[PDB]
Amino acid sequence: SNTQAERSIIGMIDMFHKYTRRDDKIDKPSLLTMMKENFPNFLSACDKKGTNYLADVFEKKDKNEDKKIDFSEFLSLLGDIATDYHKQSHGAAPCS
């Protein structure tokens, strides 16, 4: 058996593979769907802060402008989210 940590990481890959296309990449409307379905509290925090994260996230995370989100671009996206929570845990405000 694998530790929780290991399990947790595999989960993200499983999550990824729930929204990818044949090419192992996620298109924009799917990426938005993914966001809405899996990080709603995060989003509600940005909108309450007056920020609509979904408006440009795709545009900011598609670093190579291939109109697709690959796993690495995907990793970065999660990175930004984790990061916001971290700052939160040291007091900081959500979406900051």
Place this chain on the structure above:
Amino acid sequence: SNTQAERSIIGMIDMFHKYTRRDDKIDKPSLLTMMKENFPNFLSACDKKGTNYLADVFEKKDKNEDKKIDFSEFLSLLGDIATDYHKQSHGAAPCS
């Protein structure tokens, strides 16, 4: 309420702080410990291939050489792991 996804992220942050002692960063011995307790299979997989990941992980990831791993350096570490497991999902062997 929190999705599986959100909780999983918060968990990573919790795991992180477990090894920070009273401050906000992880020393080398603490990181190695974190690795052994939370990624044993990834580790064994590495050893089986004849690779001891622990040998330079700290050195590889302390990008700013302050001889501590801050949350950002940490996320990069977990990226390398996540990335390995991604590839495994496409067949490939652990620790490659």
